[PDB]
Design a binder for these strands. Structure first.
Ligand SMILES: [Zn+2]
Ligand SMILES: [Zn+2]
Ligand SMILES: [Zn+2]
Ligand SMILES: [Zn+2]
Length: 118
DNA sequence: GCCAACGTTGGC
DNA sequence: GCCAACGTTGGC
């Protein structure tokens, strides 16, 4: 389950109080049953939750411990759009096999195992 | 514990 | 085929 980034112009904009979802909020005098965010606050690049860890080694992102961009990528968590697996690419045992990175979402790709199947 | 809100589905 | 409603997760 992804969480809003809290840093995009969408995230930092206040609730309009006039859209369909704001109108449902108790704070704006609604029943509070829809439980959805303001329609003007839809995060552009949602992030993995703080507690996300690699399926294989059980650790979180360690990309700050490495300098090079390839090394950093391998120590970062990547979530597969297809199999939903969150893993460090360096924790995978597929040599040359490359996935397909999604640039619209952070830590998002179609993993090397799925691209090969597909 | 409070509260915001993601992802999915049955009922229309 | 849509969407209100809900269970339940995530940040604080
Ligand atoms: Zn709104
Ligand atoms: Zn955002
Ligand atoms: Zn790992
Ligand atoms: Zn996959």
């Amino acid at each position: 389950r992804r969480t809003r980034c809290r840093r995009c112009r969408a995230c930092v904009r206040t609730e309009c109080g006039d859209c369909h979802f704001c109108r449902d909020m108790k704070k704006f005098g609604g029943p509070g049953r829809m439980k959805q965010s303001c329609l003007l606050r839809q995060c552009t690049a949602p992030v993995l939750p703080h507690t996300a860890v690699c399926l294989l080694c059980g650790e979180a992102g360690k990309e700050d411990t490495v300098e090079g961009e390839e090394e950093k990528f391998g120590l970062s968590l990547m979530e597969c759009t297809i199999c939903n697996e969150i893993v460090h690419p360096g924790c995978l045992k597929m040599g040359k096999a490359e996935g397909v990175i999604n640039a619209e979402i952070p830590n998002c790709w179609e993993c090397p195992r799925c691209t090969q199947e597909g």
